[PDB]
Structures are given as C-alpha cells and as structure tokens.
Symmetry: C4
C-alpha cells in the first residue's frame, strides 16, 4: 500500500467495452432496492465500487413518492460492490447529505457529502471511514460538488466545489486535500464562467475536470489542475461538438474561451470527456434537448481545435431510451502501463419524463476503453414502466 | 491493539456536524427492518457501529403489534454497521434482554444485557462475544442499566446499574469491569437522589455520567468516576437550564445538590450533556412536556454554575417532530489530539404519541462536534405515518 | 491454531443464564426466514453458530406447506451466526440431507449429513468445507445420526450413528473421525438397548453421550466414549427421574442397566443431560405425554444412583408452550479453567400440535450454566399462530 | 499459492454422492431470488462456488415475464457461495453478457462473458476481478462459449468459442489464456463437425472437452487439448450410448469420426462425460426427446469402442421431472492424490415445457464421484408450478 501517483498516460481508445450494469430498476420492481440518483463508480487497490445518493427509501416503498426532489435530510452517499443493485442490505454509508464526491489515494478513501438547508449547507470530509474536516457554506446558496470521483496524486486529492447561483456568477473553489485535511484553497481562475458537477481524471501528473456550465454555455468548461503545485487554469472545450444538454445544433466553430449559448429547455447536465490530443473522446446525450440517448464521439484535438469534429462514434444508449448524468473514473490500480478511461451513464427512470409513477430513480451502466474495434448495442435501463403502474 | 486510556481532553465544540442517520422507519415501511428502541452508538479501533434493543419482529410484521411494551423474552441487544437500517440480515446479536450497555476497552468489546421477570432479572456480561459473568437482581425490581455506551480506561470499564422503584428511592450501583470480570462494586453515594439510564463519556482521566432522575428532579444527576481509584461522587447539574423531560420552566437558579422538581406529565427521559467549563453543551427535547424536537444549548459552566444560561443553540430536530432518548458516545480512537463529543437522538415513531398504528419503534440520527460554525437543519425521522395506516 | 484437548473439568452449575434466542417464527411471519427443524449450536475458536436442517423453503412460502415431513431431497444442514434467524441470505450450507451432526476439532469443522431413500441412505462427511468420505447404509433403514454437535479430542471426533428400525432393535455404530477420515468403527456394546440422536459433551478426557431409546426406555441411554483409546461402554441413566418424552410417572427406583418402559403416546424425543456426580443436571419436557414445556433439574448422582431425585429446578419454557428437541453443546474455546455446560431447546411451531397452519418449523433458545443463583422466566417461541392463519 | 497443474489422474468412480443443491425455485417462490439459466460450478483453493447467467430480475418480479429469451442487455454472469440460492444480496457480478465461462488458475479467477447484438458480439476477459482483454466477433453471428468452467494448467487456460450458424458449419476457435492475456488462437481441427457449449475437465496433463454438435450429431463431439503445447484434436464419442438430447434410440454401433443423425424435435443440449478407459461415465437426459430426467451411465471405453455399453447406472433426476444443461467441474485443490469428477444438472422450470407461467428459470443440483457403492434418489427441482399460477 502506497499513495497513487498519476505517473501513466491514457491508453489509446478506439472502442468502448461493457464493464458493469446493475439493472437496479428491473430488480427493484420486486426486490428491496433503494431509490437513488447522481451515481458514479470509483476504484481502489482491491477493485471498483458503485456510488450514489440514496433517497432513504426503497423504490417500491410508499416513500419513493416525491423523490424527484434533489435535497432532503433523508439522502446519503452509499457505496456497494460493482454490479449489484443498491439495497438496504448490501450498501455502505460513506456520508450523509445530498451532493458528494469520493476517491481513493492508494491508502484510504476520502468521501465528502454536503447537507443542510439551501442558505446554510456544510460539507463533511471523511477519510478511512472517519470524519476529518467540516466546511461551512461560503456563499449561502447550496454548497455542492462533483457527483463523481475525485482524483489523487502523491496523497493530494483536489476537489471542485461550487456555492452560489445556478443561473448566475457563482463562487467556485478548488480545495486540495490530503488524508481529509485541507492543504490549500484556491478560488476558481481562468475563462470558465460557471462550474458545476466536474467529472475528473488524471494522467501524466495532470488532472482534467470537464464540467457543467449551468449559466450560459452549451460547451463544457475544462479545468486543468496540477496536484503537485496545487494550481489550476480554466477555459472551455474548444470543439464545435457541443456536449452539454439542451444545446443548439453544433456550430461551424466552437469557442475555447467563452460559453456558446442556446438550447431548450434544460440549462445543463453532468458530463465528461477524455482529452488526449488525437486520442480524445466526448460523451453527450444524443438528444440535443433532453436526457435521452448517449453517444461517445472520438474528436481528435477537441481540447485545442475549434474546428475539431468526430472521426468515430459509438451509441451507448439509443435515443429511444432515457439517460442522465455521465462522468469519468479510472481504475488507476490496474495492471497496465497506461491508465484506461472508463465512464458511467446514469439511466434515469421516473419523473419528470415518465410521470405515470410518483418516484424518480435510476440504474447504472459503465464502460471502459478498448484498443480493439468492438461491436456495440444499447445498454438501456431495461425496465417496463407499465409494471410500476 | 492496547487498552484505551482516557489521556486526551475534549475537543472544542462550537456547532455539530452530521455523522449518520439510518432512516430506519422510512426504509422499514417496505424492507425487512426490525422494530427497535433504546438505540445508541459505540466505536472501537476500526470504526463506529449502531446498537439498539430489538423487539424480535419487523416493523411491517404482525408481531410489531404490541411493541410499546418495554420488556419481553423476545428482545435482544443488536449492533450493525453505522448508517445502515437494522434488518434481520445485517445485525449482530450482542446479548439477550431488554436493557443494556456496551463499550470497547481497546482490545475487545464488553456487552451487558438484563433479562427476566421484574422481580428476578439478571445481567449477563459479555466480552469478546463470549459470556463472562452473571449478576442477579439485588432489589428484585427490574435490574436495569445505561441504554447507551460505557467507557473504559486501562481496561477498567465502570457501568452504572439500578434496581428498585422507578418512582421512589432505589438501589444504584457502579460496577467496575475488566475483561468482563467484576473488579469492584460500589453503592451509589453523594447527592443524586435517583439514578437511571446514564450517558457517560471520558476525557482527561475522568468519566462523567449524565443521568435520569425519574423520581424527583427535572435537572439531571451527574456522577463523576475515577476509573483508576474506582470511586465516584454524585450531585446534580448546577445549571438553571433544565434538561429532563416533563420539566417546568427553567427557574432563576438551578441547584447543584438537590433536585428541581415539577413538570408534567412524565417523570423522565434518558438524556446527556458534555461538561468541560466554558466548552459545555446540554441537549434536551424542545418541548418541556413531551419527547418532541431536540436542541443543543451551549451553556458555559453548566456543571458548576447555578446561574449559567445558553450562549448558543442548534436545533437538531424541529418541534413539529418526535424525538426520544439521547445519549453520548465518542470515537476515542480517532486520529485527533482531543476526544470529540458525539451524540445520538432516538426518533420514536408510533405509540403512544401516534396511535393510528399498533406499534412503537425508532430511527436514529447522530452528530459530532465541530470547531467551525456550521449551518444546521432538522434531522427528523422523515416517515409518513399515514403510509402505515 | 491447535487440536482441541478435553482436559478441563466441567464447571460447577447452580442455575442457567440466557445465551441466545433467535425468535425465528416471530421474525419469519414477515421476513424471509427458512423453514427448519432439528437445530443445535456448535462453537469453534472464534465463536458459536446455530445449526439446523432447512426444508428448502421460507416459512411464509407456499412450499412451507407439508413441511411436517422429516425427509426430502430439499433439506440441508445450514449454519449461521448465533442469534440471527436463518434466512436464505445469511446461512451457510454445511451439507445436503435430512439428518446431521457437526463439530470443530480446533483446526477445522467436520459436518456430516445423511440423505437418500429410506432403504438406501448415505452419509457424506465434510471437513474444512470439502467432502471427505461417504458411508453407505449398513442396515437399509434410514441411516441417521445425532442432530446436535459431536466432540473432538486431539483431532479424533467420535460420532454415534444408527441404522435400523425405530421401534425395534437397530444397528448402532461409533465412528471415530480425524480430518473427516474414518480412524475406527465400533458396533454399539453395553446395556443400552436402542440408540438415537445422541447429545454429547466432553470433560476430563471423557465424552458422554446422552441419547434417545425409541424402542423401550423412558429413561435415557448413556454412552461413555474414550476418544484416545477409541472405545466405549453403554448403559442407562440410573436416576428414577425419567427424561424422555411420553414417559410414565417417575417410579420409586430407576434402573442403571435396563429400560424403564411405559408412557403414551410417543416413543421418544431427543434430549440431553450433564453428568458430574453432585454437579448433575437433567433436562426434560414438563409434560410427560407431549413435547410441551421444558425444565432443568439438578439431580445429584443421576448417573450412578437409582434413587436420585431433584434438589433444584429451573423452568426454561412454561408448560403452556411447545418445546421439542433439546441437546448439549459447550464453548470448549472459552477463556475459563472449566468447560461450562450449555444447551438449546427447539421450539416447534405448527403441525401436528398446531393444525391451523400447513407447516412445521421451530425457533431456538439456548442457555449456559452459572455458579450463581439466577432468577428465571420462560423463553417460549413467542409467535402468535393466529397471525399465520 | 501457485499455478495449478493437471498431473494427477482421475479418481475411480463407482457411484455419485450429493455435493450441493440450492432449491432456488422453491425458495424463490417467496424470497427475492434472481431469474437465471446456464448455471455451473467452479472451484478454487478455498472451495467451490455456483455460477449462472442472471436475467436481471427476480423470479416473482414482473420482469420475469419473457425470460425464455436467451440474450438481452440485462443478463450477467453471477457467482455465489455454493448451496445458497442466487439473490440480489449474495451474488457477485463476474462480468456482463449472455454467454460465459470461468476458471481459477490457482492464483486468480478468469471470467469471460459475451454481450452485444447477434451480428456484433464481443467477449470481455476478466482476471482477478479486472477486465484484461476484449475479443470482437469474427463470424458476426452470436459469438459464444462454454456455459461451464474452463480448466487451467501451469498458468494456461484454454477456452473453446464458437461464432457462426447454430444449424450449420460454424467457426470454432480455441483460445489459450494466461492471466487473461491471449497466448494463442487456433481454428478448430479434426473430425468434430460442429461445436457448442463444451464441458471440460483435466487429468494426466490433458484437458478433454465434451461438447454439443447442434448441427447434425446425436453423439457428442470430444476435443482433446494439450495445455502445454497449446494444441488440440477433435472427434466424436465412439460409444453407441448416444448422449445428446433429441436423439434416436441407441444404434448397435456408435461412430468415432462422424455425427450420428436423427432424433426430434431439438437439435441439442449442453452435456458432459468423463472419459478414462474403464473408469468412464456418460451423463444424459432420460428422455431421448426432451430435457427430462437425468441419468449417469458407466460406459467402459466409451471414448474408443463403438460397441461400448453401460455396466452400471444411477438416476440423478427421475423422468417425471425436468432437467436441462449439465456440465463438468472438479475441485482440483482437494486434498487427494487424484482428481475426483463432479457434475451439475440444471433443473429448468417454466417455459417452454411449463407454459402456465410467463418465465423460465432453473435451480441446481451437483454431485461428485465416490469409490463406494452409495444408494441414490431423484434430486429434482421440487417446486410446485401451481403455486406460481
Ligand atoms: C445539489 C443539487 O441539488 N444538485 C442538483 C443539480 C442542480 O440542480 C444544478 O446543478 C443547478 O445547480 O442538478 C440536478 O438538480 C439536475 O439537474 O438533475 C441534480 C442535482 O441533485
Ligand atoms: C426517451 C425518448 O423518448 N426521447 C425522445 C425525446 C423525448 O420524447 C422528449 O425529449 C420529451 O420531452 O424527444 C426527442 O425528440 C429527443 O429529445 O431526442 C426524440 C427522443 O426519441
Ligand atoms: C428497563 C426498562 O423497562 N426501561 C424503560 C425505562 C423505564 O420505564 C424508566 O426508566 C423507569 O424506570 O424507560 C422507558 O420505559 C421509557 O421511559 O420509555 C423505556 C425503557 O425501556
Ligand atoms: C411533535 C409535536 O407535534 N409536538 C407538539 C407538541 C405535542 O403535540 C404534544 O407534546 C403532544 O402531547 O405540543 C407542543 O405544544 C409541544 O409539546 O411543544 C407543540 C409541539 O409542536
Ligand atoms: C432421520 C429422521 O427422520 N429423524 C426423525 C426422528 C425419527 O423419526 C425417530 O428418531 C425414529 O427413528 O425423529 C423425528 O421423526 C421426530 O420424532 O420428530 C424427527 C427426525 O427428523
Ligand atoms: C403446550 C400445551 O398446551 N401443553 C398442555 C398439554 C398439551 O395440550 C397436550 O400434551 C397435547 O396432547 O396438555 C397438558 O395436560 C400437559 O401435557 O401437561 C397441559 C399442558 O398445558
Ligand atoms: C448464446 C446463446 O444464446 N446460447 C443459447 C444456446 C444456443 O441457442 C444454442 O447453443 C445454439 O447455438 O442454447 C440455448 O439457446 C438452449 O438450447 O437452451 C440456451 C443458450 O442461452
Ligand atoms: C418431465 C416429464 O413429464 N417428462 C415426460 C416427457 C415429456 O412430457 C415430453 O418430453 C414433453 O415433450 O414425455 C415422456 O414420454 C418422455 O419424454 O420420456 C415421458 C416423461 O415422463
Ligand atoms: C399515492 C400517494 O401516496 N400519494 C401521496 C399523496 O397522498 C399526497 O397528497 C402527496 C403529497 O405529499 O404525496 C403523494
Ligand atoms: C390488528 C391486530 O392484529 N390486532 C390484535 C388484536 O386482535 C388483539 O386483540 C390485540 C391484543 O393481543 O393485539 C392486536
Ligand atoms: C393451501 C395448499 O396449497 N394446499 C395444498 C393442497 O391443495 C394439497 O392437496 C396438499 C397435498 O399436497 O398440499 C397442500
Ligand atoms: C402478465 C403480463 O405482464 N403479461 C405481459 C403481456 O401484457 C405482454 O403482452 C407480453 C409481451 O410483452 O409480456 C407479458
Ligand atoms: C505440479 O504441482 C506439484 C505440486 O505443487 C509439483 O510438485 C510439481 O512440480 C508440479 N509439476 C509440474 C510439471 O509443474
Ligand atoms: O439561544 C442562545 C443565543 O442564541 C444567539 C442569540 O439569539 C442570543 O440572543 C441567544 O441567547
Ligand atoms: O425442585 C427441587 C426443590 O425446589 C425447592 C422446593 O420446591 C422443594 O420442595 C423441591 O424439592
Ligand atoms: O444398468 C446397467 C447394468 O446395471 C447392473 C445390472 O443390472 C446389469 O445387468 C446392467 O447392465
Ligand atoms: O455534419 C453533421 C454532424 O456534424 C458533426 C456533429 O456536429 C453532429 O451534431 C452533426 O449532425
Ligand atoms: O463508414 C462509412 C462512412 O465513412 C465516413 C464518410 O466517408 C461517410 O461518407 C461514409 O458513409
Ligand atoms: O476514413 C474513413 C472514411 O472517411 C471519410 C471518407 O474519406 C471515406 O472515403 C473514408 O472511407
Ligand atoms: O453517434 C451516433 C450517430 O452515428 C451516426 C448516425 O448513425 C446517427 O444516426 C447516430 O446518432
Ligand atoms: O413428587 C412429585 C415429583 O417428584 C419428583 C419427580 O418425580 C416429579 O416428576 C414429580 O412430579
Ligand atoms: O421432584 C421434586 C421437584 O423437582 C423440581 C420441580 O419439578 C418440582 O415440581 C418437583 O416437586
Ligand atoms: O420444574 C417445574 C415444576 O416446578 C415446581 C412446580 O411449580 C411444578 O408445578 C412444576 O412442574
Ligand atoms: O436394451 C437396450 C439398451 O441398450 C443400452 C442403452 O443404449 C439403453 O439406452 C438401451 O435401453
Ligand atoms: O443399457 C443398459 C442399461 O444401462 C443402465 C440403465 O440405463 C438401464 O436402464 C439400461 O438397461
Ligand atoms: O439408467 C436408468 C434406467 O435404469 C434401468 C431402468 O430402470 C430404466 O427404467 C431406467 O431409465
Ligand atoms: Ca449549459
Ligand atoms: Ca425527572
Ligand atoms: Ca423412549
Ligand atoms: Ca445434436
């Protein structure tokens, strides 16, 4: 056991293979499955786990009614063995709250959750399963964070947090942790105009966080973090291939340093990309308006070229099925000379798009890169809504 | 592993951060969750766990009917991973009976349960998960104990027990254990006139037990124990801020050495406080009459000053929601230079306050000290009783 | 770490303290609890576990219907953490069949199950979780064994087995195992005329098995086994206090060497006793006709004196409640200078005594000796049969 | 821990003893049990586990409806502790997909699953719980594999795969893995004309794979693999005792080098055999037409003599009960001088044979060889289909 160092480059990726799928809604139709949303996966030296914000009720329970609501005193971050569906019997409570992140540094796991009222939230930072630090809201408006895993290097794990408006300038900070203790706090710098729900990974000693601009941009903000110097820079993804949801049609040219407006009717969704020159892949919903479908697009130089377009594609979820948030993770402890990109897609079921039921929940699908040319099919949730009526 | 020694001082506390909530009643409305009461938490070198007295049925089961009853041959102390809800599938039986205490001495856990008929109860003392000692009733009237964790120092774990009337003078003893064997027994001494359900913690080589006087006082008795000499003193919390339930209004002056009587209609409830000069916090139900709401009041010198009032407060459970028992615990194995205060609140649902159902049970919330000034909100149970009708 | 040696003497016993109780039937009214019968307990260096023969269905399942039947291809020996109820989620399948025994030699656990048709059953002997040895029926009539734990000394664990009529002379053997391999087989010798379902325990290098004579005696046969020499003798309990069920009134004198007959209407039930001169205790159903109630009786010199009677008694289950099989076990790995006797009572619910349901199952209660004079109460099953109607 | 090698000989087998049975359909009538099919068992240094392809839904759930269907994005290979029934709470996801194999090389477990659309399937190869290698379909027609365990020798684990028509010549390959990495690929060679679903086992440094010819033969193809040279040969079982399902009556002579045609109405079923000169056993369904009943036949020189007939038999499942797939496995880590043959029988319930329900699933029974002459009885599933109507 030692601290993880981000000493390896990203593996070449040409295709995406299936890693895990929990079929939670299908199973939760009759088994005791907790309602969730905002899932992800995170790994450690022993393997990978799935994570999500429980709503403190089962899917078939009468308390599933009303779970469209994002914040309550009944939510908590829970983790479970990858592949299983989350039940009250197989899940570990990482922390209490309604927004979270988590990562392993090679020694222990840090987990963070925000809870409390809108104008007075606080974060609690846990390490090795114990509470270490507490951070009060600094802008009095829903202190909140990534909703996917953080990334560590030589013991130092940066985390992106925001507090302030969802539709206006907000106060974002990069907080650098070691064993759950604050090493440094920076205010967000650079040209990104709004930051939410960053999806982050590391490679070659560099951490990149592709985030959600909920205020103006249909293009995604990118923050580049040096976890050794504990400094960062920010801007937008340059590609004309817009990846936020509710975006206009892709334009002739993207914009590296300003948001591209437009889209209807959603201001944003969590998402991700892996940016590695020619070896760059962008995820997005297939629908430009809604959280339906999901596609991976290989867009060489998407980080630096406003003219970059797709040279290959892979449908992860067809546009006849619902998707949701998407984010990045990597099994940094794999026995490979490169760090292989993985991602998950949250498959939201229920409200508001399916209003024949009273609840909102999701299942999870996750895939990682392949150098091979693999065939594919749609990994939709798979549940029949009529069965819940 | 080594014996825990109470060598550290209490951490400074200015507010309370969320530690855990199990949402047991919400989840138990449709998953297989045990009916409980008298819950608490207790930690060890590896972490913290939740404890409670099962009723030997699930919340939705037909045998949940009648569970307002406190004592039966179908109760047992159970423990389980912090944050999970107590099911028949994830709970460890610590011992059999209907009143208990438990604590880890740094090497192993000691667990104690009382069972039997009112006029002939006995305690069984467990250590390392094996029964070590048995203790028969000495006053033939519901031999009973703490209903929250005991505390250990150099292997010596004092426990406060009582046998005798609930509504008149009784026979309290402090029994000193090491590896589940009786080292010494003392009869209660000092100015506390009635002792029940003590909530105890350790700091700076001194163990403090804040208890319930079910006979006269609305102020809580306080026993101070020297675990090395195995001797003690007792009196009452000096503060005018009364913390028992069914208490009258706070008077102008409290009384260190005599009970402050009054209040209606109930003689008492298990509660707690941390007492450390200016760094003192008293918990109580917000209602002076019923087990509803729960608030933490910072009252400097509450332990010694009859005129001490609150300088701050934090609502833990709003007064439109049910509370219950409350008690102290500490993660004595945390990687801190001080012992940080934690507490839990039992959130009782069902009878007698909610008679639309035939059962009585509870969920749990737990919080710990923070040196920061954190925002707060209500951590009420969150179940809808109508769903159970 | 090492093979257990039976070198310690039995602890002095003056009353019985509660060890465990699973409340399976109460819990199983709603939770997913397996139908069982023929339970017992058995310990190893880490702790104690509960055992029983599942019927391959849950209590509330439609397949619980018809579970009065003793033998099917759907039964198996399962073990689980002491105190929990047996569910499909927390039980380990030891082996497959419809008669069993099990014991730990200090290194690993041996478990044995018989299965197959009446005229052609077979035993499979398991060790450390792997199948070691198979034993075919020698008399073509329901090869069967103890239905409670065996006992090992220096790695040698003798097991008593019977093959032959239940209501006439049969063929009993003592098979000595080591690591699941047969070391020696002996034909039953001595004065016991019929042997079934032996309840065995060890002390001072000697193993005593108290059994059920289903053919003639209402007094119980006693087999004494020397595990080093691998030899034995047999006779009956001498006491006039008869302990099998469906017995006549206790006569003026018992008989050391021949069966005391009589009783109505059933030939036998599994039972046990601890025999240590003055320190001797006999368990039996309170009713002399049916398996109801259960009492422990201290009968000095029960093993040698035909006029020995009780000098103390403890009611374990009141005569208004159903009991069932009873058997011996000891936690040989306790941190004590003596081996402390323990026993369990099988609490049978359903058919044939409770015919308003279609199933037969049980719950378990277990107790151990105390040197103290402890109060007591009835530890009956606690389920309300009407809730299953 | 070392790499396992196959130098030991097969144990002599004269009868079959019961190893395990999970009773999953009986139990799943009321507990939360996953719908499965294509089960098997596989062992490692610690013991054995049960495997199967889940359908991503419980047996009682509404999504059970439609589970006759073999391939969907909702299936996954799951493993669990031998003897338990597969629930959402005790199952490990080995990989995602609708065809699999798995085996332990003495150091870690390799698991492989195929998923994707019929024309573009892909395999993901896992080792030690991590994804290692991906393989795209090469014939573009349902790439598929063994549905029972693979076998490893000195780090090398051969796997047989097929891609192509089910009803005509297809493209079978042997792929040799080491730590999940491809060491070599071979096209099928020899006189076997069609290969599906091989049941494989090792002894004397040689792996034999007994398969299913779904195109022509009612006799079973046999593939002999040398795991050191990484080469193979193929032909058919010589015996007149035909072991596929939907076969004609046994002819007077079998055929070592060509398929024997006939039987109605089904083209084949996964099965197995142990081939060891005189010590040879063939399994098959009792019915020549349908997947009903199951018998083991000892047929000396079945691998080499076309006139070889049975010299003994054992009924495993009577012909009044449904059977299904059957396959081979061995506990190669047993403490024995020889490798003892084991096998399982999949017990299919529901569609198409039991059309009164909407689902298809199964339970499992497994047996291993014995040198003794043990009696036997039928180990059928035991659920009442009426209870599911
Ligand atoms: C802390 C919190 O409530 N986060 C919520 C965020 C915010 O609403 C937006 O990022 C605006 O800040 O996104 C969601 O609401 C959403 O769009 O589904 C889900 C998530 O629970
Ligand atoms: C899951 C689904 O049905 N998605 C469909 C959506 C939704 O019906 C609307 O977004 C509802 O507002 O509409 C589309 O035009 C889109 O947005 O891509 C087509 C897509 O197939
Ligand atoms: C052993 C026992 O019965 N303890 C019970 C005590 C006593 O009744 C009082 O302390 C009076 O002695 O408090 C309760 O009843 C109560 O107030 O809810 C709960 C608890 O179960
Ligand atoms: C949980 C709850 O509703 N509490 C309410 C109680 C209860 O109605 C009574 O205690 C029932 O006896 O009444 C109050 O006046 C009080 O006690 O402060 C107001 C409080 O909001
Ligand atoms: C193997 C077997 O069937 N054992 C059964 C035995 C025998 O019937 C008797 O000992 C007569 O041999 O006792 C029972 O039937 C019984 O009385 O409740 C239960 C047990 O299952
Ligand atoms: C559990 C129970 O009800 N036991 C009762 C039994 C049974 O009813 C009969 O044995 C059934 O045949 O009858 C008694 O006379 C007896 O045996 O002592 C009284 C006892 O209270
Ligand atoms: C990958 C796949 O679908 N395998 C299926 C195979 C193929 O149909 C045949 O081997 C023909 O190739 O056999 C089954 O269908 C069957 O007979 O019950 C079950 C199994 O799921
Ligand atoms: C389980 C069962 O009932 N099997 C019966 C089968 C099936 O009914 C048919 O195969 C359905 O196609 O028919 C038989 O003639 C046979 O196959 O030997 C008799 C056998 O008892
Ligand atoms: C089916 C159901 O339970 N519906 C409830 C409804 O009764 C209630 O009015 C609403 C507001 O809380 O929440 C939902
Ligand atoms: C709904 C229900 O079960 N009610 C029962 C009732 O029949 C019984 O009179 C009471 C006392 O035992 O317990 C409760
Ligand atoms: C309620 C129920 O299922 N009853 C069945 C009954 O129909 C059947 O006659 C009997 C014989 O097996 O088993 C039981
Ligand atoms: C009882 C039930 O749910 N039946 C459904 C049926 O309505 C549907 O037509 C069929 C095809 O999808 O699947 C099944
Ligand atoms: C096979 O394993 C055995 C037992 O570990 C070992 O003695 C032998 O050297 C190995 N044989 C080969 C050929 O590797
Ligand atoms: O409630 C304790 C204290 O809280 C703060 C202020 O509201 C004070 O006026 C008050 O005394
Ligand atoms: O039960 C044993 C003894 O218990 C006591 C008294 O009730 C005696 O009469 C009795 O002999
Ligand atoms: O069943 C195969 C063999 O079984 C035995 C004898 O009945 C033989 O005659 C028979 O060939
Ligand atoms: O050229 C059409 C195609 O270009 C690329 C992307 O911008 C797509 O959104 C678009 O459909
Ligand atoms: O792969 C087919 C596809 O390749 C790219 C472009 O050349 C398209 O015109 C063409 O349809
Ligand atoms: O490179 C794939 C595809 O790209 C585009 C066109 O240039 C095609 O001619 C070519 O086949
Ligand atoms: O990226 C997915 C995309 O690929 C191209 C076309 O086949 C589209 O229909 C599809 O949406
Ligand atoms: O004398 C009555 C009493 O004596 C003694 C025992 O034999 C009991 O069974 C009996 O009830
Ligand atoms: O037998 C003597 C005595 O033993 C004890 C109890 O069973 C009493 O009922 C009985 O009188
Ligand atoms: O041992 C039980 C025994 O105790 C004595 C008396 O109360 C009897 O009625 C009872 O049977
Ligand atoms: O007696 C004919 C007999 O021959 C042998 C086997 O092939 C059996 O299946 C068959 O019944
Ligand atoms: O085929 C010879 C013989 O083999 C064995 C059994 O299958 C018998 O039914 C059969 O007669
Ligand atoms: O191999 C089983 C076989 O044995 C012989 C006969 O009893 C047949 O009826 C039976 O099918
Ligand atoms: Ca946006
Ligand atoms: Ca009081
Ligand atoms: Ca008898
Ligand atoms: Ca065929």
């Amino acid at each position: 056991r030692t601290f993880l160092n981000l000493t390896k480059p990203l593996c070449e990726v040409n295709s995406w293979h299936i890693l895990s799928k929990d079929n939670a809604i299908r199973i939760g139709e009759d088994a005791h499955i907790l309602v969730t949303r905002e899932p992800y996966l995170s790994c450690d030296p022993q393997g990978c786990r799935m994570f999500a914000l429980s709503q403190g009720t089962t899917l078939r329970g009468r308390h599933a009614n009303g779970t469209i609501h994002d914040r309550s005193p009944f939510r908590a971050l829970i983790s479970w063995e990858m592949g299983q569906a989350p039940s009250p019997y197989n899940t570990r409570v990482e922390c209490i709250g309604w927004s979270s992140t988590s990562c392993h540094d090679g020694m222990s796991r840090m987990s963070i959750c925000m809870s409390g009222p809108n104008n007075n939230a606080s974060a609690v930072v846990w390490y090795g399963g114990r509470p270490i630090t507490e951070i009060p809201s600094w802008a009095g408006n829903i202190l909140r964070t990534q909703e996917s895993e953080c990334v560590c290097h030589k013991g130092v794990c940066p985390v992106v947090m925001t507090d302030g408006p969802a539709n206006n300038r907000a106060a974002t900070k990069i907080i650098y942790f070691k064993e759950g203790k604050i090493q440094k706090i920076e205010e967000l710098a650079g040209n990104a105009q709004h930051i939410e729900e960053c999806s982050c990974y590391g490679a070659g000693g560099v951490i990149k966080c592709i985030c959600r601009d909920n205020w103006k941009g249909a293009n995604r903000p990118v923050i580049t973090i040096d976890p050794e110097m504990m400094t960062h820079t920010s801007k937008y993804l340059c590609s004309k291939v817009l990846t936020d949801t509710s975006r206009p049609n892709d334009p002739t040219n993207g914009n590296c340093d300003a948001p591209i407006t437009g889209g209807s009717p959603d201001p944003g969704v969590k998402g991700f990309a892996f940016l590695d020159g020619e070896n760059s892949w962008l995820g997005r919903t297939i629908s430009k308006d809604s959280r339906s479908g999901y596609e991976m697009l290989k867009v060489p130089n998407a980080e630096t070229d406003i003219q970059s377009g797709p040279i290959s594609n892979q449908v992860i979820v067809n546009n006849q099925n619902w998707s949701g948030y998407s984010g990045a993770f990597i099994d940094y402890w794999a026995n490979k000379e490169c760090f292989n990109p993985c991602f998950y897609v949250e498959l939201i079921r229920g409200r508001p798009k399916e209003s024949s039921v009273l609840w909102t929940s999701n299942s999870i699908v996750a895939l990682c890169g392949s150098k091979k040319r693999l065939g594919s099919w749609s990994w939709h949730d798979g549940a029949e809504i009529i069965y819940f009526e």
